[PDB]
Design a protein around this ligand. Sequence first.
Ligand SMILES: [Zn+2]
Length: 258
Amino acid sequence: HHWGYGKHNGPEHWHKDFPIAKGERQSPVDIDTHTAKYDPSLKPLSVSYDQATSLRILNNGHAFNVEFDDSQDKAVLKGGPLDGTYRLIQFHFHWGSLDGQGSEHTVDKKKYAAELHLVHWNTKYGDFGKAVQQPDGLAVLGIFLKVGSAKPGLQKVVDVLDSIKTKGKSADFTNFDPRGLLPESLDYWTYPGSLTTPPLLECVTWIVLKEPISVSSEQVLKFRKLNFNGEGEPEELMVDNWRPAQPLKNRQIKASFK
Ligand SMILES: [Zn+2]
């Protein structure tokens, strides 16, 4: 029926409705650190989020998205392997039912507790919907989360989750600064890939940061209290909303560092 992360509608079934699931540039992938090519031609990333305007948080039934005003160049990403300016539209996470799983990308087969995706679209295409139809339409920054110390900048998100527990619920979420979610270092790996949920379009330049951020056990516990279902439907906790690693095929992962 409709796609999800269960036994009957999970990632191994997606190809029946979205054949591109077996495509040549699907994400996520495992990052083999000894095979990644250092590329000295890659520039440092430029993250300009000081004028970011968050608007709302929404449970869409597969994750929770924090959405931003993308009608102007307020929160943008440029540099790195990118040509042009990419505007932030939303961020969301993928997480597990246990601390030893949850991330989509892996590093030398190591899985993290969760993975944050900051989604941006190439302004040359005018809107998000046109951007997803192009090979260079989106840039996603992926950041791993490990369990350890609490991340103060994540607490405002954790605290509003009770108000969007079920699918289709939304809440006003203004004045949230996404700078509180970045690691200290911006070293990264990059490769050409896709969206990790249907429609699985191959329009993404992924930028995965080497340095994870730490979150407390209590913080991730609050993520696992969300629901996949809508209000008044049988409760299905929102956990393990990650797609496993896909074949690298004819692709090279480049590193911005050595
Ligand atoms: Zn994602």
